[PDB]
Write a protein that binds this ligand. Structure first.
Ligand SMILES: [Zn+2]
Ligand SMILES: [Zn+2]
Lengths: 303, 44, 49, 410, 58
């Protein structure tokens, strides 16, 4: 009952995607007329936009006023009447279940059964159960079992690593042995920061433009591994290392390394240092304490 | 039988990626042993 | 050097024709800091003494 | 004395630099400064036959079969090989799907009267023990993708595809004169009583209803080569009828113990001892099969799984999914080996069988029909996953043969 | 006079790391004069005369 970490068993789902986006094309085409193939699916899905540190959204202003009803019964069935027969042609080529699916989604009914729920694969079905038990155990705080699941899973030759947050929070709550969550994360960044589609939303990403979740979370969580303190010049040595200039969050990580190292004229230079990086962190999309609070800690230091 | 166990003295041989240890003892320290081959000397 | 070139950048983005005096004290504080430590690094080279 | 590098600093070479320790560097002259087409029938049948003998190797070796099986297999695979090479067309028209491998294995086993049944095969292959789910598994040969598809396709046995393919082979070469296609019935009864926790009287009960409708004559062909069928022939794979009689027997027997030999309670306690998910090799296996069974609920069943079952599962995963399919590689063996992959307890088969036979050993009012029903439906569930058929398939059969007992009783 | 030298090709590896270098010969093309000093394991035959530049290890 959880997402599976495998490419979905194929044929019928793809030919259904065909029927769907093809009919979609015919209806929206005739709709723009009245307002006047993997590749067909491709163009179709294509022409469309593809007090705490909230990476805020884009709110409501500068957006256009209105519309008033476009679609009566007669007018809609006008748009619908013809593209449904065009569909009658290749429906004759697809399978009866697929045809039924086309009939029902085109009535507007939504199918009872998931792609997983109708999938049936023998190595893949076993991997489905494996991954499932991983997610279930991780939900169940069963970090021991869950760890066994994870190791046995990553063993298998089919799994590339979405599963990393599983192991980040996994080894995190594990505390047991193995070179830990931080080690894993900095490994992720060291292996996958160099040249050395379906599956991919944002929580796993490529390093052309922002790889987000895992990077920022090892960043902050490492600054909290300095909350353990009051290793740092290491963390900001390899936060110093990378150029991926649209961060600023590593500027606040940097200035936090200088506030943690500031806890004699050396300590002075560290306090002037954090004073600098807080403004070169006003460079970008701001992470702000009132920051006169930051400075007030810095005057408790100036003591 | 190229090697010898340093602890139990059992003569034994290895292979490609094999347990670098005595198959009897489990001691992990092995002495090399040496084979019919021509070395030439001058008797002086 | 880079760090002072930044202090010098924020320093010019005064008027303070408006602009409330005291920052004058803090800017000086940062400048003294920079001069002292560069002067130290030079001394150390000519001179670690 | 070589290093090749630094050509030669003399434009009538460049001939080839070795450095002496004295740093002259010296150059030789002496300055010192694809797949087959249209008859890959032969290769196809070779990867197929090779995969078969591979599986036989695993079952004499790892399952302690008899060596005679192999000869029985050369005979059956020989008969149908001779029949597909008594066929002309360059258009292949053969279907050597994996169901044919398992089909001739079961066929041969059943001639030899060995007490192995289809559910043994389903378990064996779904637990990756017996290699199955691949063409020449990841390690072989590059064939026309038309035949790799003729292998990878039709892989599942899980809607009775196995019963249908063994009957189909049983037509392809004839069961009757050539072989002895009587199933090993009574061992299936034992397997079944022990598979529940039924007291040993039900072996003789169901054995008797068996004798009552059949007088114990059980065939293998359901063949009239086609697709087409619509009456009489949901129920003539012997096994499925055995399970049908078994179910029926339990229902009748328990609902008409006017003696009151079987307590209103012990049917519940039987249901609960049957239901308690416990971690033996078997139940762990049935979980592994539950994972690749087509229909819900059985996947909701993986949802409701116990930590030891999952553990022995990952065990069987690292053991029998080394039977997987299809520099930087060792860099990922060390790379993954950077973070850890991570008096004999559980009991044997006749031990479990004994202990539920005892769990009911207290042997010596209309809502007990409920207990009968839930027990029958749990037993059904186990049979459905174990014998790779459908809910609707099973109940079609036991319905038909139940009317087949009422008809020869009324 | 006797001298003992220790050859330890785990000298570079970062602690319990994957092992890059294994005593023995590969299947690429290498001198062959090497087998005059070295046995199949990549260790030198006992008794061998060895002067500056010779192999003592492969
Ligand atoms: Zn020894
Ligand atoms: Zn030259």
């Amino acid at each position: 009952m959880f997402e599976v970490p495998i490419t979905l068993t194929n044929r019928k789902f793809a030919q259904r995607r065909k029927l769907k986006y093809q009919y979609i094309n015919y209806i929206s085409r005739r709709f723009d007329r009245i307002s006047k193939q993997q590749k067909k699916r491709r163009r179709e899905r294509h022409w469309r936009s593809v007090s705490f540190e909230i990476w805020r959204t884009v709110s409501s202003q500068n957006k256009q006023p209105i519309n008033k009803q476009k679609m009566t019964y007669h007018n809609f069935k006008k748009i619908e009447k013809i593209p449904l027969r065009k569909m009658e042609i290749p429906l004759l080529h697809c399978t009866k279940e697929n045809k039924l699916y086309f009939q029902s989604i085109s009535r507007g009914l939504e199918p009872l059964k998931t792609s997983t729920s109708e999938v049936r694969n023998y190595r893949t079905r076993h991997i489905v159960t494996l991954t499932d038990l991983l997610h279930l155990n991780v939900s169940r705080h069963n970090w021991s079992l869950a760890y066994k699941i994870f190791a046995t899973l990553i063993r298998i030759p089919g799994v590339q690593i979405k599963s990393l947050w599983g192991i980040g929070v996994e080894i995190l709550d594990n505390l047991s042995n193995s070179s830990s969550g931080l080690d894993f994360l900095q490994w992720m960044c060291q292996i996958y920061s160099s040249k050395s589609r379906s599956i991919v939303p944002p929580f796993q990403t490529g390093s052309r433009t922002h790889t987000a979740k895992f990077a920022i979370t090892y960043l902050w969580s490492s600054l909290i591994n300095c909350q353990k303190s009051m290793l740092i010049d290491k963390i900001s040595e390899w936060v110093l290392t990378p150029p991926f200039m649209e961060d600023a969050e590593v500027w606040f990580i940097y200035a936090s390394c200088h506030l943690l190292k500031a806890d004699i004229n050396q300590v002075i230079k560290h306090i002037h240092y954090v004073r600098t990086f807080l403004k070169i962190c006003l460079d970008k999309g701001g992470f702000a304490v009132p920051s006169r609070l930051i400075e007030n800690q810095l005057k408790s230091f100036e003591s | 039988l190229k090697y010898i166990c340093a602890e139990c003295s059992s003569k034994l041989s290895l292979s490609r990626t094999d347990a670098v240890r005595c198959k009897d003892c489990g001691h992990r320290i092995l002495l090399k042993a040496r084979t019919k081959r021509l070395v030439q000397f001058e008797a002086r | 050097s880079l760090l002072i070139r930044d202090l010098n950048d924020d320093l010019s983005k005064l008027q303070k024709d408006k602009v409330s005096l005291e920052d004058r004290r803090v800017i000086f504080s940062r400048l003294m800091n920079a001069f002292v430590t560069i002067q130290n690094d030079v001394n150390a080279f000519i001179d670690s003494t | 004395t070589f290093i090749r590098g630094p050509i030669c600093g003399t434009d009538n070479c460049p001939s080839r630099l070795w450095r002496i320790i004295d740093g002259r560097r010296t150059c030789q002259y002496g300055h010192v400064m694809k797949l087959i087409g249209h008859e890959a029938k032969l290769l196809f049948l070779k990867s197929f036959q090779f995969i078969l003998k591979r599986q036989i190797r695993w079952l004499i070796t790892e399952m302690r079969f008899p060596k005679e099986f192999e000869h029985v297999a050369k005979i059956i695979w020989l008969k149908i090989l001779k029949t597909i090479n008594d066929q002309p067309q360059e258009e292949l028209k053969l279907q050597l799907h994996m169901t044919s491998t398992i089909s001739i294995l079961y066929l041969a086993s059943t001639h030899l009267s060995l007490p192995v049944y289809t559910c043994d095969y389903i378990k064996w292959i779904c637990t990756a023990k017996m290699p199955y789910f691949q063409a020449s598994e990841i390690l072989r040969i590059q064939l026309p993708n038309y035949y790799v598809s003729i292998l990878e396709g039709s892989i599942s046995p899980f809607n009775g595809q196995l019963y249908n393919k063994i009957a189909l082979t049983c037509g392809m070469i004839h069961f009757k004169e050539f072989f002895n296609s009587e199933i090993s019935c009574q061992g299936l009864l034992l397997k079944l009583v022990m598979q529940c926790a039924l007291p040993p009287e039900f072996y003789f009960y169901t054995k008797q209803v068996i004798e009552f409708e059949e007088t114990d004559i059980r065939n293998l062909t359901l063949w009239e080569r086609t697709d087409e069928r619509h009456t009489g022939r949901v129920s003539n794979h012997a096994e499925l009828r055995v399970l049908s009689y078994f179910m029926l027997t339990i229902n009748w027997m328990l609902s008409f113990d006017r003696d009151r030999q079987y307590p209103l309670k012990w049917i519940l306690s039987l249901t609960e001892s049957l239901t308690q998910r416990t971690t033996t090799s078997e139940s762990i296996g049935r979980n592994i099969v539950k994972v690749v069974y087509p229909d819900k609920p059985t996947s909701s069943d993986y949802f409701q799984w116990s930590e030891e079952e999952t553990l022995e599962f990952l065990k069987w995963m690292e053991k029998q999914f080394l039977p997987t399919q299809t520099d930087q590689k060792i860099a990922r063996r060390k790379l993954y080996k950077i973070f850890p992959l991570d008096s004999t307890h559980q009991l044997t088969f006749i031990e479990d069988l004994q202990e539920r036979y005892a769990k009911q050993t207290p042997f010596f009012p209309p809502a007990r029909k409920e207990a009968i029903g839930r027990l029958l439906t749990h037993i059904a569930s186990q049979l459905l996953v174990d014998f790779a058929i459908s809910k609707e398939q099973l109940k079609d059969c036991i319905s038909r043969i139940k009317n087949a007992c009422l008809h020869r009783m009324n | 006079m006797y001298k003992t030298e220790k050859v330890d090709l785990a000298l570079n590896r970062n602690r319990g790391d994957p092992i890059t270098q294994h005593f023995g010969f590969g299947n690429d093309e290498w001198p062959k004069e090497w087998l005059e000093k070295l046995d199949e394991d990549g260790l030198p035959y006992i008794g061998t005369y060895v002067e500056e530049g010779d192999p003592i290890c492969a």
